[PDB]
Amino acid sequence: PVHKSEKFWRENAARLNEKNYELLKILTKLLEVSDDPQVLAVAAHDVGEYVRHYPRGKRVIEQLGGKQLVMNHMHHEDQQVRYNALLAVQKLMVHNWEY
Amino acid sequence: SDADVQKQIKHMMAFIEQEANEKAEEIDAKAEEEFNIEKGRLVQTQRLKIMEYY
Amino acid sequence: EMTLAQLFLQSEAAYCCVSELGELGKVQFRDLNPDVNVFQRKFVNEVRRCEEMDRKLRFVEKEIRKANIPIMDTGENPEVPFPRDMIDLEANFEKIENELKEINTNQEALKRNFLELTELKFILRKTQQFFDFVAGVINRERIPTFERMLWRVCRGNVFLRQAEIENPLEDPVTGDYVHKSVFIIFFQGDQLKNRVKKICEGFRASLYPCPETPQERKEMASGVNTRIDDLQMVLNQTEDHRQRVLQAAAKNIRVWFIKVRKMKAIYHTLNLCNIDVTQKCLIAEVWCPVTDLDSIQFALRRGTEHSGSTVPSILNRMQTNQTPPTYNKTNKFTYGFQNIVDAYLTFLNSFKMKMSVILGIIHMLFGVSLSLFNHTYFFGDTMVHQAIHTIEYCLGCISNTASYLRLWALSLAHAQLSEVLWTMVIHIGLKVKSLAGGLALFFIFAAFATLTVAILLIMEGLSAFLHALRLHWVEFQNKFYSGTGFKFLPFSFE
Amino acid sequence: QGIQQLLQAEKRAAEKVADARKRKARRLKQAKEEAQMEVDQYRREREQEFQSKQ
């Protein structure tokens, strides 16, 4: 229920950045390396909630390169994994800073 | 058919006893927390004062 | 021949009995607790839950047409969903509701993201071509008056670059599908920046930051290249996610209407229950036909089984002093003809007047004789009332029988204009000596085809039809019909 | 009518839940004097170790 709670994502916004931000990339390292047709679906929605509650984390996600990992995971054969990655990748480019 | 007045005494009185019994039996079986637990409170008060004379 | 005979419920059979009772359509639920407001009718919280799904269904039927999706019908009266299934519906209804509300706000932000980055991308090629500070975009139609004003108020100068972009782009509301042009505002002065920004907003130009240094322009051009195609990917991937659930909704919304609309109807009758009194059992005071007392009771016996309840519901009979609402055959080619009444040369002159007057006397005779059979079916103020009853029948039938004389005289109106119409058809067109058989008879026979029906059958026909209603209403229904009336209004399906 | 046989029936359902709210409101004070029987009894529970140590 913490992954779907709006209070959990709003309060623990900078909790990923205060924890030596690669710990947020440790969620991305688990999402990129492992397949996990049910467990990566939680990894997709938690990554978008970090981007929604922190626009500067989009630069941190671009630093870790998780956007290309989420784009490649969007073409997965699983239905719920592709649906969760579609909501996450569209939230990843919602702010649109200049390149 | 005149049995509609009897059908009232047949089965609407059955709704009387099910709320009579099975709601009071929920109350009557609540002595595990209102008679056993409340007995467990006052025996500590007797064991509070027996641990001076012992 | 109705009865207000009482009907009892037990609130475990309050849905499945009433729903199958509402799957028959012979019942006239009557509210007998009028001393209560429109709220606190035992179910106000749950009828809003049906209304919230109604609000979601009236919203989702609108957005299903803006994407222009064909709608499945498969027209059949379905099974009414139980309150067990009701909580499972709001999980499914709000899933479609929250996804489609999010996407239309997300796709519009994504489309705004897509056009802005393509507008920024096209200025990177044209300026790096010209190179080998303000950069911005303006449409072609406003560029000659822009540089005329830019030369005017800046008035030192800014060395303007004019270069037109290719095939038309579109910012969402301004501007819709126009080919624009780039410009270059170097000027090196950093004071005239204020004096050009007012002009850039006055001509409504869209400006973007350029990196201004060599080989970082091509660096960011490679960056926005990979950003746009990923944005182009997810834009259609939201769209194929969109259309796959529109057609999933297109197989749903037609039957999903009559699920909750039947539920909202029977729950409104669950508000119409007796007085919400003192136990977990209900009463219903309905109007019911004597010819259908058995069929609604076996349906009531059917309804208690569908919930799985072990106790059948009963039906008490009684008698009171209220309205006995009417009920009859209601046949198909008898439906429209009943609804109208429920809304409430010298020799021919002497003969047809008196025989029609006796015919109106015969119509009044059959009408006044029906009053005696209706009276057999069931002092100071009685004198003044029956005086108004009798002498308004006395002078009244004279005006009735005078209005029976028109139906021969309207036929005299029918006869005379038909000859004149006829005269034109037989005389002006056909009695032409040379050029008759072609264009002359064709326009006159068309007048004999089209102009006679609007005059003799449309307006003369409707007036006598409206006269025949007056012969029925004020001249025939005034003899036996009391004219009070009260309709049945059974609990219907749609 | 059927409502007249039902009105006295519901009062029969009403009284059987009424006294269950009363005998559960009587026994709770009775538990306070049944768990106060222990002071009359566990003075003898102290008497075995009064006799064991003696």
Provide the angle, in degrees to the nearest 10, between the axes of the packed helices A39-53 and A66-74.
Answer: 130
Decide: helix, strand or coil at residue C487: coil
- Beta strand spans in C405-484 (E): none
Identify each DSSP E strand in chain B by its residue range: none
- Let me know: does C250 contact C70? Beta carbons within 8 Å: yes
Distance from CA of C28 to the nearest CA of B (A): 21
Smallest Cα–Cα separation from A66: which of A55, A58, A75, A78?
A: A58
C128, C171, C225, C287, C339 from C210: Cα distances, Å: 10, 20, 15, 81, 77
- How many Cβ atoms are within 10 Å of C328's Cβ, its own excluded? 8
Tokens (6 digits) for C387: 């005086």
The answer, for B17 touching chain C at a CB cutoff of 8 Å, is no
The verdict on a CB contact (< 8 Å) between D38 and B46 is: yes
Query: Across the interface, do C315 and B4 touch by the CB < 8 Å criterion?
Result: yes
The residue written with tokens 């639920």 in the block is C29
Distance, C-alpha C451 to centroid of its chain: 37
D2: contact with C, CB 8 A cutoff: yes
Q: How far apart are CA C90 and CA B3, in angstroms?
A: 43
Residue C315 three-state SS = strand
CA angle C236, C242, C248 (to 5 degrees): 145
Contacts of B1 in chain D (CB under 8 A): none
Q: Ramachandran region of residue A63, left (φ > 0), alpha (ψ -120 to 50) or beta? A: alpha
Asked if C280 and B15 come within 8 Å (Cβ–Cβ), the reply is yes
Are C21 and C303 a contacting pair, CB within 8 Å? Answer: yes
Cα separations in angstroms, C123 against A74, C142, C175, C193: 31, 18, 17, 20
- What is the pairing mode between strands C180-184 and C282-289? unpaired
- Method of determination is cryo-EM
Beginning with the edge strand found earlier in the chain, give each strand of the sheet holding C206-208 in spatial order.
Answer: C163-164, C180-184, C135-139, C206-208
Give the CA-trace dihedral at C395, C400, C403, C404, to 10 degrees. Answer: -130
Q: Does D17 touch chain C (CB under 8 A)?
A: no
Whether a cis peptide bond, with omega within 30° of 0, leads into C360 is: no
The secondary structure element, H or E, covering residue A33 is helix A22-33
For C79, the token pair is 């099974």
How many angstroms away from the CA of A72 is the closest CA of chain C? 11
Query: Touching check for D16 and chain B: CB below 8 Å?
Result: yes
Beta bridge partners, A4, equal none
Residues C157 and C151: their CA atoms lie apart, in Å, by 6
Element (H, E) at A42: helix A39-53
Helix boundaries (H) for C154-216: 193-202
Q: Chain B contacts of C282, Cβ < 8 Å?
A: none
**Distance, CA of C137 to CA of C123 (rounded, Å):** 8
Residue window 34-93, chain A: list those with CB within 8 Å of chain C: 67, 71, 74, 83, 86, 89-90, 93
Give the residue on D whose Cα is nearest the Cα of C283.
Answer: D3
Beta bridge partners of C206: C137
Contact C258, C77 (CB under 8 A): yes
Q: C464 forms bridges with which residues in the sheet?
A: none
D25 interfaces chain B, CB cutoff of 8 Å:
no
Alpha-carbon distance of C154 to C198, in angstroms, equals: 11
Q: Which two tokens stand for residue C62?
A: 């609108």
Q: In C251-379, which residue ranges form alpha helices assigned H by DSSP? A: 253-270, 293-306, 335-343, 347-376
Contact check, Cβ <8 Å, D5/B9: yes
In our burial notation (b when 16+ CB lie closer than 10 A, e otherwise), range C135-149 reads bbbbbeeebeebbee
Judged by phi (left if over 0) then psi (alpha if -120 to 50, else beta), residue B44 lies in alpha
**C388 token code pair:** 């108004």
Q: How far is CA C348 from CA C250, C411, D37, in A?
A: 69, 11, 122
Please give the Cα distance from C451 to C438 (Å, whole number).
Answer: 19
Of C304, C309, C316, C303, whose CA–CA distance to C274 is shortest? C316
Cβ atoms within 10 Å, residue A12: 15
A 10 A CB-CB count for C312 gives: 19
Q: Rounded to whole angstroms, how far apart are CA atoms D14 and B19?
A: 9
Other Cβ atoms closer than 10 A to C60: 19
Measured CA angle at C440 (ends C434, C442), to 5 deg: 140
Which element (helix H / strand E) includes C382?
helix C380-402
Cβ distance D16 to B24 less than 8 Å, yes or no, reads yes
- Partners of C182 in the β-ladder: C137, C163
Specify the residue for token string 């007048």.
C447
CA C323 to chain centre: 33
* C116–chain A Cβ distance below 8 A for any pair: yes
Which chains does C contact via 3+ CB–CB distances below 8 A? A, B, D
Q: Do B11 and C312 touch (CB under 8 A)?
A: yes
- How is residue C180 written in tokens? 């624009």
Nearest to C194 by CA among C127, C123, C134: C134
What are the angstrom distances between the C-alpha of C20 and each of B52, C77, C177, C327, D44?
A: 75, 12, 57, 22, 72
Query: Scanning every residue of chain C, which has its alpha carbon at the shortest distance from the alpha carbon of D12?
Result: C279
How far is C123 from C164, CA to CA, in rounded Å? 10
Q: How far is C263 from chain D (nearest CA, A)?
A: 29
Q: Which residues contact C249 (CB under 8 A, 6 or more apart)?
A: C60, C64, C69, C96
Q: Answer yes or no: are the C-beta atoms of C151 and C258 closer than 8 Å.
A: no
Strands C206-208 and C163-164: unpaired
Contact in structure between D10 and C279 (CB atoms under 8 Å): yes
Cα separation, C246 vs C448, in Å, equals 55
Task: Report yes or no: D14 at the B interface, CB cutoff 8 Å.
Answer: no
Angle at C71 between CA C70 and CA C76, to 5 degrees: 155
B2, closest residue in chain C (CA to CA): C316
Buried residues in B15-44 as b, exposed as e (16+ CB within 10 A): bbeebbeeebeeeeeebeeebeebbeebee
Residue with tokens 């916004």, as numbered in its chain: A13
Q: Which of A71, A96, A99 sits opposite C113 (nearest CB)?
A: A96
Coil vs helix vs strand at C29: strand
Rounded to whole angstroms, how far apart are CA atoms C100 and C93? 11
CA distances from C179 to C143, C164, D9, D34 (A): 12, 8, 85, 96
Q: Are the Cβ atoms of D10 and C278 closer than 8 angstroms?
A: yes
Residue A92 burial class via C-beta count within 10 angstroms: exposed 0-12, middle 13-18, buried 19 and up = buried
Are D1 and C316 a contacting pair, CB within 8 Å? yes
| Residue C153 near residue C195, CB atoms below 8 Å | yes
- Please give the Cα distance from C372 to A87 (Å, whole number): 81
Q: Give how far C314 is from chain D: nearest CA, Å.
A: 10
